[PDB]
Write a structure and sequence with these properties.
Layout (H helix, E strand, L loop, with lengths): L1 E2 L2 H7 L11 E5 L2 E7 L4 E6 L8 H12 L10 E5 L6 E5 L6 H5 L10 H20 L12 E3 L5 E3 L22 H4 L5 H17 L13 H9 L18 H14 L10 H11 L2
Parallel strand pairs: 1-5
Antiparallel strand pairs: 2-3, 3-4, 4-6, 5-6, 7-8
Helix pairs in contact: 4-6, 4-9, 6-8, 8-9
This protein binds ligand O6X.
The site of the ligand COc1cc2nn(CC(=O)N3CCOCC3)cc2cc1NC(=O)c1cccc([C@@H](O)C(F)(F)F)n1 has 20 residues, from strand 2 and strand 4.
GO molecular function: ATP binding; interleukin-1 receptor binding; kinase activity; magnesium ion binding; protein kinase binding; protein serine kinase activity; protein serine/threonine kinase activity
GO biological process, one term: positive regulation of canonical NF-kappaB signal transduction
Cofactor: Mg(2+)
């Protein structure tokens, strides 16, 4: 962890080249992600930008304060920052296999993830969330776009800008993933569990949480329909796998179903989610 010149980051990203492969790797609510090389190391550079006011500086310090000295197997690693130039920048260890969202959608012609790799990714993500909840942190934006994958497809939770240590007026997050109480402005770790429930649906189905062109448009409505015997999980299992067995899929769905209880107090805690995912692969 150290301070970077805005001009070093500007330089190694080809003046923040917004063309894909180019240097642009992705885009979120709070900025663009660029590929760069500093200190003999390939890095991800998030240039923060707005909705969000000067609150983007508050998410900048929030993430630095939370991640500056954090090391977990299943959390992304912050290498440093830049605040000496035009825009706020965060520099991370490069995740060569990008986001779970992008790998589930097979963006850029990447091969589909096997059920084996999907099970390991779910366990890792839950281990990442468990670490945060143990340290009395709430993520507030758990989704497939915020689960990154390293050179061994190890799951790394990312984007701690909205993380906290309760009601609020400023309601923020991705609505396709957000628990009902989180939409009303509640801040609780139980909201993170609900969101993880949706990530598990993405993993089982390979479908995005929201699709404008889909009936139904929200993936958590497909879950509701399965529970009302209007559909079966078997009909929605991702066709792009050869190694998926009914038992382990149905076991993961069971975890996702428990996570997606609309009443927060009925949902399992992260420790219970971890255990049920372990018994899935045993
Ligand atoms: C959304 O971000 C990324 C997208 C990417 N795409 N790729 C290419 C890729 O995945 N391919 C597969 C192999 O074949 C070529 C295509 C690597 C990517 C890496 C990305 N992110 C990070 O490395 C990273 C690390 C730490 C923290 C963060 C986030 O907090 C941030 F900053 F992005 F918001 N991101």
């Amino acid at each position: 962890f150290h301070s970077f010149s805005f001009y070093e980051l500007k330089n190694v990203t080809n003046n923040f080249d917004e063309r894909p492969i180019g240097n642009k790797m992705g885009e979120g609510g709070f900025g663009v992600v660029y590929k760069g090389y500093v200190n003999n190391t390939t890095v991800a550079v998030k240039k923060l930008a707005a909705i969000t006011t000067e609150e983007l500086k508050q998410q900048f310090d929030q993430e630095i304060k939370v991640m500056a000295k954090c090391q977990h197997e299943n959390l992304v690693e912050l290498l440093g920052f830049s605040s000496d130039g035009d825009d706020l920048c965060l520099v991370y260890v490069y995740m060569p296999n990008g986001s779970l969202l992008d790998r589930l959608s097979c963006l850029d012609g990447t091969p589909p993830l096997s059920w084996h790799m999907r099970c390991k990714i779910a366990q890792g993500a839950a281990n990442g969330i468990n670490f945060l909840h143990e340290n009395h942190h709430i993520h507030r934006d758990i989704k497939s776009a915020n689960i990154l994958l390293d050179e061994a497809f190890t799951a790394k939770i990312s984007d701690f800008g909205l993380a906290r240590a309760v009601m609020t007026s400023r309601i923020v997050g991705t609505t396709a993933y957000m628990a009902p109480e989180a939409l009303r402005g509640e801040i609780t770790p139980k909201s993170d569990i609900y969101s993880f429930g949706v990530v598990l649906l993405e993993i089982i189905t390979g479908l995005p949480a929201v699709d404008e062109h889909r009936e139904p448009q929200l993936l958590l409505d497909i879950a509701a329909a399965i529970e009302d015997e209007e559909k079966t999980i078997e009909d929605y299992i991702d066709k792009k796998m050869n190694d998926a067995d009914s038992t382990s899929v149905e076991a993961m769905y069971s975890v996702a179903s428990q996570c997606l209880h609309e009443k927060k107090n009925k949902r399992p805690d992260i420790k219970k989610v971890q255990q049920l995912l372990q018994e899935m692969t045993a």
